Amino acid sequence: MAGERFPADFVWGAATAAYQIEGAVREDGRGVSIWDTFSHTPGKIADGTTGDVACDSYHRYGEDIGLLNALGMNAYRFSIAWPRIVPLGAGPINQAGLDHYSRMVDALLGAGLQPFVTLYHWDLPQPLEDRLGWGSRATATVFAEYADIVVRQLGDRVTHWATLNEPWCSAMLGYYLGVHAPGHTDLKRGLEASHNLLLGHGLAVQAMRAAAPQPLQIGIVLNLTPTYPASDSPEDVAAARRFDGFVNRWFLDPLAGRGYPQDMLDYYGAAAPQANPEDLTQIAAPLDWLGVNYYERMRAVDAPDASLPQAQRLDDPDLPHTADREVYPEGLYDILLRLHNDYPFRPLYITENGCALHDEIAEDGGIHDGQRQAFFEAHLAQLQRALAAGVPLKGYFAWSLLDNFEWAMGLSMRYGICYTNFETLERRIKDSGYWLRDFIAGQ
Ligand SMILES: C[C@H]1O[C@@H](O)[C@H](O)[C@@H](O)[C@H]1O
Ligand code: NA
């Protein structure tokens, strides 16, 4: 009921992050990141792996370009590693680092692949974490200095930039739940980190506008989880609102000029961050787009005896599941309709969508990942519905181009549209990747 075609100028890409794919962790002046420290801490990664080699994309990005070209994509979302650019976090530049990314940008543009660059995809320089990391306002200031450096050199060629990827993860997984680097476990520290991440975003936007050699299209990338109460009871509805506030509105509202949501301030009490009119104005620095990373919904039941927020997930077993998630494509439509009608950000990009499976190389040599094909098919159908409703959607990036180091899950959780043999570093396009190729060409 939503037609057949996407816009002719739609952006079609795949996405990666530097620590997940690059390897070469000590090469060419790179400094230590929090993810180097964390992955080298016994027990923090499920399978004893690290990003030391990963996909070896520091050396093999040309192979990655070959895959993007084989897929007929027109864009590549990737991150720049702050440790390669400013190894001390705050300090001199490492021109060799910048020059690596300059050559990669030129290779992408030569191939007809628009670079969509993420400045911060979780790889904070360890020296900054030694000075409290996102627990310090200074980290926000020097993040903006890094953003300036990078834009000054690459902004003649790269128009589309994101400051941060998934600040909820960096703050809440990294400083509250301890599952991500740097691995702290305190709610107040997580909420403080969340504020300094938003402040760093806003300071960076302003620094990038001043350093820009041409006008830029600057955004931020948020994970969003559409949340639904398991019943209409006051208790379940309130649990859904608390979860929705914890993940989504805590970030969307300040970005939208609305301040932090008061219901969440009330809930968090004394753990809430120190945070004034001046910082809010900074946080709301005008953006040219918003990136949405969408994977799943949350169907919330009140659970008065759990950690902040007392919201238990109610699984639907009749819905399919992947290796690690429930599949719910209609949530993509729902979150986009909400953003379109309720929030000011536009245009919108889906900067990540994808799934993990127990992928293996079959006897014939292919990877028969039909559930991942079906995942893309169903989510793209929802995007057509969103477009029909007027949502100002301008592109879609599959997470991920290739299997990679999936954070606390290690190399063991495969999200690629291309398979990565981590021993030999060979990549092979999965059946879902060929489906994407053919879908994109058919448009
Ligand atoms: C599965 C995918 O999840 C998102 O949370 C991230 O931005 C990306 O690095 C990867 O973890
Ligand atoms: Na399954």
Q: For the chain, which residues make up each domain, given as ranges?
A: 1-443
CA distance 8 to 376: 19
Instruction: Name the CATH superfamily, with its identifier, for domain 1-443.
Output: Glycosidases (3.20.20.80)
Q: Among 256, 284, 385, which residue's Cα sits nearest to residue 333? A: 385
CA distance 34 to 56: 19
Are 10 and 72 in contact by the 8 Å Cβ rule? The answer is no
Is the shortest distance between the CB of 404 and ligand 1 below 6 Å?
A: no
Residue found by looking up tokens 């930039």 in the block = 161
Strands annotated E in 294-431: 298-302, 311-313, 348-352, 393-399, 418-420, 427-429
Q: Is 322 left (phi over 0), alpha (psi -120 to 50) or beta?
A: beta
CA distance 238 to 410: 35
The span from the first CA to the last CA of the chain, in angstroms, equals 17
The rounded radius of gyration (Å) of the Cα atoms in the chain is 21
Residue type, 273: P
The CA-based dihedral angle spanning residues 298, 302, 307, 313, taken in that order and rounded to the nearest 10 degrees: -30
CA distance 50 to 299: 33
CA distance 233 to 304: 14
CA distance 439 to 72: 10
Spell out the residues 6+ positions from residue 152 whose beta carbon is closer than 8 angstroms to its own. Answer: 211, 213
Q: Which of 22, 129, 145, 166 is catalytic?
A: 166
Bridge-partner residues for 228, per DSSP? 299
Does the annotation count 352 as an active-site position?
yes
Method by which this entry was solved: X-ray
Question: ω before 347 within 30° of 0 (cis)?
Answer: yes
Note the resolution in Å, 1 decimal. 1.1
Residue type, 279: D
Strands annotated E in 85-138: 114-120
Is the shortest distance between the CB of 405 and ligand 1 below 6 Å?
A: no
State the distance from the centre of ligand 2 to the C-alpha of 319, rounded, in angstroms. Answer: 9
What is the SS3 string spanning 196-245?
A: HHHHHHHHHHHHHHHHCCCCCEEEEEEECCCEEECCCCHHHHHHHHHHHH
Longest CA–CA separation in the chain, Å: 62
CA distance 164 to 351: 12
To which H or E segment does residue 222 belong?
Answer: strand 217-223
CA distance 389 to 235: 32
